Structure 1
Amino acid sequence: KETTSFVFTRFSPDPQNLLLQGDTVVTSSGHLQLTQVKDGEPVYSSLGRALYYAPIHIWDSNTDTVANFVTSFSFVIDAPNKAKAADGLAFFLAPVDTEPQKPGGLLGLFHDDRHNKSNHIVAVEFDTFKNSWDPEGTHIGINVNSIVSRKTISWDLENNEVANVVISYQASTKTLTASLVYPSSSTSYILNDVVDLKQILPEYVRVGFTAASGLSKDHVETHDVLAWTFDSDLPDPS
């Protein structure tokens, strides 16, 4: 049996147990600022990611076991003009050597808009801009190897409000669940779908966040993570 766990109720400068990629910085208020801010205003065409440094053991070919996990986090998206919000934030699992891909609507996760099994990506996206592959309206999506979500639900961005997210995986039912709550308005969202992690992901992955601002100057927003917990449990064989 193996478990991994971590908690950040806020973030420190130079977090050596996080791998920061692209534009990500830690703010003086202790937030993970994934996309760039300049003179209090979000900057366009910005992309940042942040991964926990240790690989997570998500399944084991030796014992044919698959891990459960649960992650919680708080985030804020602040768009000066909510009608022009872009592009969004995602929580993801990827190969250990994962590097940032294309900006904008591809969210730093994918190189193009196609499905490719060699991506080995599972993600939950909080998508603020309708691209050609998207459903109508802002939405939460479960993504497997593609920016084109397996499943989505409508989600209304509450501009500059704290969102509390929980994402969990139950290996026994192969179900990934994602919920988002805005305590300020008592509004809440949830979806779940079948995702077989053993078939999608390598045995070890890195986990974390990615976010991108829009590719035109008036389609901008901030993407800040305020807090993050993660717990995984790879059980003993049957």
Structure 2
Amino acid sequence: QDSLSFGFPTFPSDQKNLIFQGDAQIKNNAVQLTKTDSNGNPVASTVGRILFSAQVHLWEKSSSRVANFQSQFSFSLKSPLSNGADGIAFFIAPPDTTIPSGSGGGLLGLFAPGTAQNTSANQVIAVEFDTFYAQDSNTWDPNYPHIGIDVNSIRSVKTVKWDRRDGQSLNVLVTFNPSTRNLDVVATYSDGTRYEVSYEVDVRSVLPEWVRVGFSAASGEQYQTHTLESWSFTSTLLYT
């Protein structure tokens, strides 16, 4: 289970409970979601994701209960260029989820090209930190960097303008209150700059009772490192 929590203050190399997909790997006590060359620089055309191995019981039909959850994490993006792409996302999906074919670049390794904007064809909730919005390839993005809440589509149901800071860690807190059904996102840089965005969502109609949680990131022709530095998570089934 009714409750589950875990915390990674750092990411040592001897991991046992993480499912690594794509190019994701541990380097310097942090998770490098996207590939990097020998000297630690970001490269183009790369996708990577990680999921915690234990499944989370998001909701239970028999007891009519729904879980609340809180995911706290920090990441940093770095790039030689100034148009780093494509972004990192915290997501929740069915337990057997895998990188969809052709989900690189602006699809963040979460959606397939042909069904990226088809809500009845996906089962995923993600909080994206999108740094690339060129209208030729990312036709669905607002015209500026942003934090978005994605519900079964790459076209966010709600966004807030965000600023990308090269090499600076962003502290994020994602919370889902089953009582109000609000998914709240609070992100802050160390100097106090704060960004907030929320949306009301009934998780029971979007995801199965048991899911897995993790992160995804990608770089198409434009690139940047997507470094996940720490992550804590907790969920508890509740009667509302």
Please give the TM-score of this superposition, normalised by the length of structure 1.
0.94
Q: CA deviation at 1:7?
A: 0.3
**Offset from partner CA, 1:139-193 (integer Å, 9 cap, x none):** 000000000000000000111101000000000111000111100x321101111
Q: Residue 98 of structure 2 aligns with which residue?
A: 99
Which of 171, 175, 193 aligns to 1:187? It is 193
For residue 12 of structure 1, report the CA deviation from its aligned partner: 2.0
Q: Which amino acid aligns with 2:218?
A: A
Partner in structure 2 of residue 127 of structure 1: 130
Structure 1 residue ranges without an equivalent (≥5) = none
SS in 1 for 2:106: helix
2:236 matches 1:233: yes
Query: Which structure 2 residues correspond to residues 65-214 of structure 1 after superposition, within 5 A?
Result: 65-82=65-82, 84-101=83-100, 102-112=103-113, 113-130=116-133, 131-183=138-190, 185-213=191-219
CA distance in 2, matches of 1:14, 1:107: 26
State the one-letter code of the partner of 2:180.
Answer: T
What residue identity is the alignment partner of 1:44?
A: A
Aligned partners of 1:117 and 1:200 also within 8 Å: no
CA RMSD in angstroms, aligned pairs only: 1.1
Secondary structure of 1:41's aligned partner: coil
Maintained 8 Å contact 1:25/1:33: yes
Residue of structure 1 equivalent to 2:62: 62
CA contact (8 A) 2:75 2:226 kept: yes
| 1:14 Cα deviation from its structure 2 partner | 4.0
CA distance in 2, matches of 1:20, 1:202: 22
SS in 2 for 1:67: strand
Q: What amino acid maps onto 2:112 in structure 1?
A: H
Q: Is the 8 A contact 2:4 2:56 kept in 1?
A: yes
Percent identity over the alignment is 43
Q: TM-score under structure 2 normalisation?
A: 0.94
Aligned residue type for 1:114? Q
Point out 4+ residue stretches in structure 1 off by more than 4 angstroms: none
